[PDB]
């Protein structure tokens, strides 16, 4: 791939999350004075843990629904084996997700954006797993602090999918030059915007991992949904 490709390449995969934000930064930062009062607050720990996981999955799996249509227009993807080309977007879409909600943390107040207002962890005390809960915000926390950019994230996020060292693969000489190819695209654009101090500021490899398959679990004795 030359440099005006290794250019595009990067112009357009900033170009899908753009669409496929499911909500606009433009409104994510608009509605930050809008809080959830603590009656909405304790009413949203009346219910019971069914109810939750319900709305969860259901705005989760809403959500996990962009974020297929994004993962589609790109290159290489769709010249996989469904095999292959599932492999992935089963074990990585999650991981994807974790990652895409940072935007809806408010690190100012350590409060989320959950259906129409901003609301902290305490929003979900029904679920009995406060630990976990906080958990997953002190990761997101780890990103707003690194400040993700809408094109920082997308690129990011275009190479959690894109694992040629997930087991089950049988392309795998296939998927390893996507792979690549977005490496470099990814570098070489930190590269000519000096962000690269971050290439140790990021998350583990493997954490991003080790919390959603932590998030599955403790979902999978109440809902069993992967949406295709
Ligand atoms: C900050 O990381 C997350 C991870 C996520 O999975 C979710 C899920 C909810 C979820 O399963 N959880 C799991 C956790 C144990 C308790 C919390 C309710 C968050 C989610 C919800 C609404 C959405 C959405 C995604 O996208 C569209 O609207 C985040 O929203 C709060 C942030």
Same mark, same amino acid.
């Given at each position: 791939?030359?440099? #005006?490709?290794? &250019?595009?390449? +990067?112009?357009?995969?900033?170009?899908?999350?753009?669409?496929? !934000?499911?909500?606009?930064?433009?409104?994510?930062?608009?509605?930050?004075?809008?809080?959830?009062?603590?009656? &909405?607050? #304790?009413?949203?720990?009346? /219910?019971?843990?069914?109810?939750?996981?319900? *709305?969860?999955?259901?705005?989760? #799996? &809403?959500?996990?629904?962009?974020? +297929?249509?994004?993962?589609?227009?790109?290159?290489?993807?769709?010249?996989? !084996?469904?095999?292959?080309?599932?492999?992935?977007?089963? %074990?990585?879409?999650? &991981? +994807?997700?974790?990652?895409?909600?940072? *935007?809806?943390?408010? %690190?100012?107040?350590? #409060?989320?954006?959950?259906?129409?207002?901003?609301?902290?962890?305490?929003?979900?005390?029904?679920?009995?797993?406060?630990?976990?809960?906080?958990?997953?915000?002190?990761?997101?926390?780890?990103?707003?602090?690194?400040?993700?950019?809408?094109?920082?994230?997308?690129?990011?996020? %275009?190479?959690?999918?894109?694992?040629?060292?997930?087991?089950?693969?049988?392309?795998? *000489?296939?998927?390893?030059?996507?792979?690549?190819?977005?490496?470099?695209?990814?570098?070489?654009?930190? !590269? /000519?915007?000096?962000?690269?101090?971050?290439?140790?500021?990021?998350?583990?490899?493997? /954490?991003?991992?080790?919390? !959603?398959?932590?998030?599955?679990?403790?979902?999978?004795?109440?809902?069993?949904?992967?949406?295709?």
């Amino acid at each position: 791939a030359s440099l #005006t490709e290794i &250019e595009h390449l +990067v112009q357009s995969v900033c170009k899908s999350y753009r669409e496929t !934000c499911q909500l606009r930064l433009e409104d994510l930062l608009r509605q930050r004075s809008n809080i959830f009062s603590r009656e &909405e607050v #304790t009413g949203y720990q009346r /219910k019971s843990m069914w109810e939750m996981w319900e *709305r969860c999955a259901h705005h989760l #799996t &809403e959500a996990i629904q962009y974020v +297929v249509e994004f993962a589609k227009r790109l290159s290489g993807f769709m010249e996989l !084996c469904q095999n292959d080309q599932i492999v992935l977007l089963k %074990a990585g879409a999650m &991981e +994807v997700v974790l990652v895409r909600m940072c *935007r809806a943390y408010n %690190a100012d107040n350590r #409060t989320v954006f959950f259906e129409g207002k901003y609301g902290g962890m305490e929003l979900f005390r029904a679920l009995g797993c406060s630990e976990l809960i906080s958990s997953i915000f002190d990761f997101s926390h780890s990103l707003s602090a690194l400040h993700f950019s809408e094109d920082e994230i997308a690129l990011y996020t %275009a190479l959690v999918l894109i694992n040629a060292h997930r087991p089950g693969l049988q392309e795998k *000489r296939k998927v390893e030059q996507l792979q690549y190819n977005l490496e470099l695209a990814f570098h070489h654009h930190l !590269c /000519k915007t000096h962000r690269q101090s971050i290439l140790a500021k990021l998350p583990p490899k493997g /954490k991003l991992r080790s919390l !959603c398959s932590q998030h599955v679990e403790r979902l999978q004795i109440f809902q069993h949904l992967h949406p295709i």
